[PDB]
């Protein structure tokens, strides 16, 4: 039906997803600076990676996407170069810290004790040299793309490609992380019990 | 014949037995709120657009029901016929003023006031409460992991969205997908991200 030949959505991508390595136990994440580079240790696994269209998450050079996973984040320490660090925006419910020289994002942290996602810190697994993280696993936000301007007409092309990759096309999150967000404000609200 | 059992769940009791299809030359009708005596009235002067049931926690439902069922009119169509001092506004500082009878708790209509929202122009209206048949008839379902905010146990929510399919209505968490794509668009040319 569908043309899909030259649509790219993210160079760790473009050639096929690559599979997690199984006991897998992380890795160091360095920033693209030549010298004094920002680098930040995971150790452990990462979980529920995909790429994003949202405007807010960091994208190398040319990408229309992001791709991003989730880490607990008492598996993060920042090894060298903290001082290079600065907020994106102190006022985001997720702050993203940032090299204040080739600003890369390093990680996304949330302060917020009540907020879903409290616990995980937001990792771009591909800063990393090493294979075998978490595969990337869906789409999120795909129509948010069009707000940093990627023209309408082009969608049909580029939610037919991810769905060839495997990468499922979706305007919020996936349904169980919608889902597990959701059951999270029923519980603190009191529609549902505990 | 079946992968997920879909038995015993519910949606909205205008979807659950039987959809009525829209009808040619369908020009509009009344809607009326559930009072006994001196009821809101409301004129509907066009056929609306972009039915579909809804899981928000703010749109209204019958009693029993976990959707919504709400559609799009045209502003210059709607007029408040009867009950206009009956009426409130849930909530003057959200983004659609739902506009609701204060003895039956029904919603009559939501209205956007600002200028710049992507959905200015266009109220939204719960056609249930029409007596005629012929309206645009649901088209897929929105906001439906909301669900669980009003309450629904998530181990409930597979069967849930099995019976939306079985129905045609692809669920979606936020709306669809070509309605996510105007509302990005109406903010990127806002921007000036793209040309005007
Ligand atoms: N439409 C998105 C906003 C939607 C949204 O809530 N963003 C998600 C993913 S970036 C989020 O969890 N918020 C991040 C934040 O604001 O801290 C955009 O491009 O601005
Ligand atoms: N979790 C949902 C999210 C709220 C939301 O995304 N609202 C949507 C659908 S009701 C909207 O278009 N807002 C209308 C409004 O501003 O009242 C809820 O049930 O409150
Ligand atoms: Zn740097
Ligand atoms: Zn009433």
């Given at each position: 039906?569908?043309?899909?030949?030259?649509?790219?959505?993210?160079?760790?991508?473009?050639?096929?997803?690559?599979?997690?390595?199984?006991?897998f136990?992380?890795?160091?994440?360095?920033?693209?600076?030549?010298?004094?580079?920002?680098?930040?240790?995971?150790?452990?696994?990462?979980?529920?990676?995909?790429?994003?269209?949202?405007?807010?998450?960091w994208?190398?050079?040319?990408?229309?996407?992001?791709?991003?996973?989730?880490?607990?984040?008492?598996?993060?320490?920042?090894?060298?170069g903290?001082?290079?660090?600065?907020?994106?925006n102190?006022?985001?419910?997720?702050?993203?810290?940032?090299?204040?020289?080739?600003?890369?994002?390093?990680?996304?942290?949330?302060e917020?004790?009540?907020?879903?996602?409290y616990?995980?810190?937001?990792?771009?697994?591909?800063?990393?040299?090493?294979?075998?993280?978490?595969?990337?696993?869906?789409?999120?936000?795909?129509?948010?793309?069009?707000?940093?301007?990627?023209?309408?007409?082009?969608?049909?092309?580029?939610?037919?490609?991810?769905?060839?990759?495997?990468?499922?096309?979706?305007?919020?999150?996936?349904?169980?992380?919608?889902?597990?967000?959701?059951?999270?404000?029923?519980?603190?609200?009191?529609?549902?019990?505990?």
């Amino acid at each position: 039906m569908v043309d899909t030949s030259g649509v790219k959505i993210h160079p760790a991508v473009d050639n096929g997803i690559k599979p997690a390595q199984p006991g897998f136990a992380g890795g160091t994440l360095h920033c693209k600076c030549s010298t004094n580079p920002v680098r930040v240790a995971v150790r452990a696994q990462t979980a529920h990676n995909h790429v994003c269209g949202c405007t807010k998450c960091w994208k190398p050079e040319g990408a229309i996407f992001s791709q991003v996973a989730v880490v607990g984040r008492d598996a993060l320490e920042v090894l060298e170069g903290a001082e290079k660090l600065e907020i994106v925006n102190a006022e985001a419910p997720i702050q993203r810290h940032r090299c204040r020289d080739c600003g890369v994002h390093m990680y996304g942290r949330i302060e917020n004790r009540d907020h879903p996602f409290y616990g995980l810190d937001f990792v771009h697994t591909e800063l990393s040299d090493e294979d075998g993280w978490s595969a990337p696993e869906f789409a999120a936000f795909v129509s948010s793309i069009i707000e940093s301007g990627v023209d309408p007409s082009r969608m049909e092309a580029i939610r037919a490609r991810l769905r060839e990759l495997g990468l499922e096309p979706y305007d919020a999150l996936s349904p169980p992380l919608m889902d597990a967000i959701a059951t999270h404000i029923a519980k603190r609200s009191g529609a549902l019990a505990a």
